[PDB]
Ligand SMILES: O=C1CC(=O)N([C@@H]2O[C@H](COP(=O)(O)O)[C@@H](O)[C@H]2O)C(=O)N1
């Protein structure tokens with residue numbers, strides 16, 4: 363296990379470019395996140411390579427499909443033995459329930475099943491195009507509520523919803539929060555940001571950090587520094 | 594190439610079972626869809642093996658993430674050289690815009706880019722939980738309008754919307770529709786369904802068929818039957 367609440371988003375377009383970073387850090391420094399980019403590129407074998415080195419892996423594929431597919435996919439992720447696996451809460455109750463139920467057969471080995479609420483890159487203007495009347499926070503709370511009701515272990519959201527969410531769902535409902543920008547860092551397409559420190563104070567369980575770390579020369583050192591701040 | 598609008602959904606938990614089927618057919622008979630289940634299990638290499646056989650592959654991972662991730666994932670799909678790649682329209686305009694732009698550097702090689710509107714497994718009730726008051730039809734049409742405004746090649750929807758969409762977005766805008774159930778077959782978690790013949794008559798450009806084919810007592814003849822019906 364590890365003590366840092368940091369999950370580094372491995373978003374490279376090259377395998378060796380990722381492992382060059384990974385070989386310089388240690389499983390106690392952080393957990394790793396394999397998303398759509400690196401998974402579309404290298405598949406489940408890359409995830410096994412990381413599990414080989416001993417890291418906990420968060421397969422971030424945000425499964426957002428029909429119940430049938432969602433279940434089989436989560437079951438496939440469970441076969442991979444990942445630490446945590448994704449799903450989109452906007453996929454609905456039936457889809458989320460089918461996903462949870464697909465993990466029962468794996469018993470204890472099952473990975474944590476988290477639901478994405480509202481992407482941290484979306485503000486009201488973004489949600490407004492879908493005809494979504496509610497603010498990011500409000501809609502996100504509606505999605506998390508459905509997530510909790512379907513028995514999921516937690517949610518992915520912005521740290522800007524951490525205090526509120528922690529209160530409405532409790533300390534047990536895990537909150538995984540991306541949109542982490544230490545001060546000075548470039549926001550990019552990220553919108554509901556917060557600094558590593560602000561996120562921890564908001565009481566999040568896990569913070570997802572990508573570019574601030576991977577975009578630096580010597581990213582291991584940056585990951586180290588961030589961890590230092592969380593003390 | 595094939596002149597059939599049929600795209601068979603390869604949803605198997607066993608690589609060889611899937612190949613045993615694929616080998617009983619021919620690229621001239623249909624196209625194949627590799628979804629989250631098989632892709633999570635066997636990754637990009639499976640797609641290549643299907644491609645090495647001459648089939649046009651529809652990569653269906655419904656990328657629904659922050660603009661930066663959607664772009665890199667879509668780019669990764671183009672690197673795979675697939676015929677068609679997926680995306681979730683509810684991901685917003687900025688995300689879909691990033692996806693379209695990430696395909697520009699691939700020129701002519703760029704795969705077809707389509708956005709999923711409302712999943713065929715959903716009805717009003719399913720959307721109500723999300724706080725969505727618009728009907729599956731209207732919400733879908735809204736998602737299809739945004740998809741076109743962002744410059745995508747088409748949308749994934751129900752055949753129940755084909756007629757409407759076709760006359761509101763034009764013949765050019767491509768419609769890919771799952772939820773295809775020939776009379777007698779099981780509906781399952783599918784809700785907004787139509788038979789192959791009805792879907793064709795409805796104007797869909799491509800129709801996705803999974804269980805009706807893969808789980809039939811003789812999938813090859815079932816494909817043959819359907820293809821013949823569509824004539
Ligand atoms: O709401 C979310 C969820 C999410 O997974 N992510 C992911 O977090 C990662 C890192 O983003 P960044 O480089 O820190 O901006 C990427 O893999 C994103 O897709 C996000 O940015 N917002």
Ligand SMILES: O=C1CC(=O)N([C@@H]2O[C@H](COP(=O)(O)O)[C@@H](O)[C@H]2O)C(=O)N1
Pocket residue numbers: 427428431602604628653709711712713714749750771772773781783801802803804805
């Ligand atoms: O709206 C949609 C999109 C979609 O991709 N699909 C996919 O179409 C496939 C076949 O479903 P079925 O077996 O025909 O019910 C599965 O891979 C689904 O994920 C769907 O059923 N509805």
